[PDB]
UniProtKB/Swiss-Prot annotation, chain C:
Function: Contributes to mitotic spindle assembly, maintenance of centrosome integrity and completion of cytokinesis as part of the HAUS augmin-like complex.
Quaternary state and interactors: Component of the HAUS augmin-like complex. The complex interacts with the gamma-tubulin ring complex and this interaction is required for spindle assembly. Associates with microtubules. The interaction with microtubules is strong during mitosis, while it is weak or absent during interphase. It is unclear whether this interaction is direct or indirect.
Family: Belongs to the HAUS8 family.
Species assigned in the record: Xenopus laevis
Protein name: HAUS augmin-like complex subunit 8
Top-level lineage group: Eukaryota
Subcellular location: Cytoplasm; Cytoplasm, Cytoskeleton, Microtubule organizing center, Centrosome; Cytoplasm, Cytoskeleton, Spindle; Cytoplasm, Cytoskeleton, Spindle pole
Residues of the full protein shown: 264 to 367 of 367
Length: 98, 53, 104, 42
């Protein structure tokens, strides 16, 4: 934005940002008005449409990963209440009859 | 006592004549404009990564 | 508070208006038809990442328990196999394998 | 919008690195799960 202003200046008259110890809001809005004229310029080279992020795909995968994360937790907790408790009991009841 | 002490203050030429509904947006636009002018060299990299999407 | 202001407050608004009449006009040069959908996705992206970063932990919790399940299943079968040999061979001969080498 | 497009690129590349480490960090999960499988298939 300095590399902008230094060679806009002799067409873009602008006053100072800090004047009598107070901030000049008109100068801040004039700065924003050539900062935004980078953003529109870069869109005219790299975003020549307005690209959309698909919120329904994003929420759809977020939901489905939450369901993967839940299926993994269900399998992993079933192993740790039904299966291993069946196994470790039958093992210990074999050993204590032996 | 407070109501009279506000009515007893003549229309303040050191204030801005603006309806109270707009006071938030008017005050926050200075911080928002500063933050946008400072983020400017980040946003230009974001626009140069839009082609990745 | 501490804004630089020149003369009458209406005359300052008149000049600020001539520059906000460029800032709105530049958001009209910059806002795509999907700016809101993009701006709303912000935290749905981070919750997807938060779920996926916990799916890595949970895959890594799950397989480290399936290895325990396998090891435990195999002890259940090996103890069942051992018991069948010890009840098809003579209990005096099985006793001579396991205990007569150790008996006071 | 530009905060969310930045976040989308960062998150998309983070997820493409995390799943890569889950495949390639060590044996790997993708190796040891097939070693375990082929024991019970045998």
């Amino acid at each position: 934005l300095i590399s902008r202003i230094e060679s806009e200046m002799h067409r873009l008259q602008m006053d100072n940002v800090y004047e009598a110890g107070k901030v000049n809001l008109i100068t801040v809005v004039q700065l924003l008005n050539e900062a935004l004229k980078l953003v529109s310029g870069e869109r005219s080279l790299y975003d020549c449409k307005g690209v959309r992020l698909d919120l329904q795909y994003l929420h759809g995968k977020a939901k489905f990963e939450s369901e993967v994360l839940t299926r993994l937790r269900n399998m992993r907790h079933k192993i740790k209440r039904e299966d291993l408790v069946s196994i470790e009991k039958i093992i210990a009841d074999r050993e204590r009859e032996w | 006592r407070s109501l009279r002490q506000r009515l007893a203050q003549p229309v303040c030429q050191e204030n801005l004549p603006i309806e109270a509904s707009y006071h938030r947006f008017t005050a926050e636009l200075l911080p928002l404009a500063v933050n946008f002018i400072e983020k400017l060299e980040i946003y230009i990299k974001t626009i140069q990564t839009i082609p990745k999407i | 508070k501490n804004i630089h202001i020149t003369g009458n407050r209406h005359r300052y608004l008149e000049e600020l208006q001539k520059h906000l009449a460029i800032t709105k006009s530049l958001l009209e040069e910059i806002m795509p038809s999907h700016a809101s959908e993009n701006a709303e996705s912000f935290d749905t992206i981070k919750d997807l990442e938060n779920i996926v970063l916990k799916t890595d932990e949970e895959l890594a919790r799950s397989f480290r328990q399936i290895l325990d399940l396998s090891f435990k299943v195999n002890k259940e079968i090996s103890l069942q196999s051992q018991k069948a040999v010890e009840e098809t061979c003579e209990s005096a001969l099985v006793r001579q394998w396991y205990f007569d080498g150790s008996l006071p | 919008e530009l905060e969310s497009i930045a976040q989308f690129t960062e998150t998309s590349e983070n997820i493409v690195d995390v799943v890569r480490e889950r495949h390639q960090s060590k044996s790997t999960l993708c190796e040891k799960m097939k070693e375990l499988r082929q024991s019970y298939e045998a």
